[PDB]
Amino acid sequence: LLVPKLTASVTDGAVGVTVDAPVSVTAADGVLAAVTMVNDNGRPVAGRLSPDGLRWSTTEQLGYNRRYTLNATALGLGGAATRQLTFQTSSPAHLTMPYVMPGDGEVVGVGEPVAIRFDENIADRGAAEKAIKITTNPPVEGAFYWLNNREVRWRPEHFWKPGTAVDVAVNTYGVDLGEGMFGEDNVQTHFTIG
């Protein structure tokens, strides 16, 4: 007969915790009976408990420069377990907001690149690229190229084909884009090649 086991995806006393991923808690040999997370001013963080009670996860954006307190209780045939932990999230030197072109909902020509322009210097171009997901349909191969320290573009080898959906997810919220420059938020754009 085992006592329930709680496992969180963050450690107690962690610092610099990145806010580009949710925080989770799992139970084994039992189910989650209560999970709460609050910030340093006592504001609850939204989360979702799976219907089977085995996993809870945050469902909204954690803030920069915050201390979060997580409490969980699991209950099983073998008794109860509780855990509390506290951690601190990333403290950016600066924030940068990206702007994507073409604009959301636009219909554009066969020579138009995807362009992602950040409003501050990007010292880690590789980190910025990794945070950007391009979807094409019909699918075509393409690649990123930087114009300068602020603007990265993406295109196929030659021209686009008319009737192509292009989806651009710029997910740099929580990502250190070099020298403590973090994404201010995520951006989502979808357009069509006419």
Q: Please tell me whether the peptide bond between 4 and the residue prior to it is cis, using omega within 30 degrees of 0.
A: no
* Structural resolution in Å: 1.5
CA-closest candidate to residue 190, choices 97, 108, 96: 108
CA 128/CA 169 separation, integer angstroms: 12
| CA quadruple 12, 18, 24, 29: dihedral, nearest 10 | -40
Three-state SS letters, 97-136: CEEEECCCCCEECCCCCEEEEECCCCCCHHHHHHCEEEEE
Could you give the C-alpha distances from 138 to 5, 141, 143, in angstroms and in order?
46, 10, 16
Report yes or no: 70 and 85 within 8 Å, Cβ to Cβ: yes
Domain with CATH 2.60.40.3780 in the chain: 1-94
Q: Which two tokens stand for residue 109?
A: 């020509």
Q: Which residues line the annotated binding site for Ca(2+)?
A: 176, 179-180
CA-closest candidate to residue 101, choices 177, 174, 182, 166: 166
| CA quadruple 37, 41, 43, 49: dihedral, nearest 10 | 0
Q: Which two tokens stand for residue 3?
A: 């006592």
CA 191/CA 193 separation, integer angstroms: 7
- CATH number listed for the domain at residues 1-94: 2.60.40.3780
Domain with CATH 2.60.40.3710 in the chain: 95-194
- Output the CA angle 88-94-99, nearest 5 degrees: 115
Report yes or no: 184 and 173 within 8 Å, Cβ to Cβ: yes
- Quick one: CATH architecture of 95-194? Sandwich (2.60)
| The pairing of beta strand 55-58 with beta strand 24-28 | antiparallel
Q: What is the DSSP string of 28-73?
A: ESSEEEEEEEE-TT-PBPPEEE-TTSSEEEE-SPPPTT-EEEEEEE
Name, in order, each residue with C-beta under 8 angstroms of 42's C-beta and a sequence gap of 6 or more: none
Report yes or no: 112 and 104 within 8 Å, Cβ to Cβ: no
CA 189/CA 101 separation, integer angstroms: 8
- In eight-state DSSP terms, residue 174 is T
Q: Which residues line the annotated binding site?
A: 176, 179-180
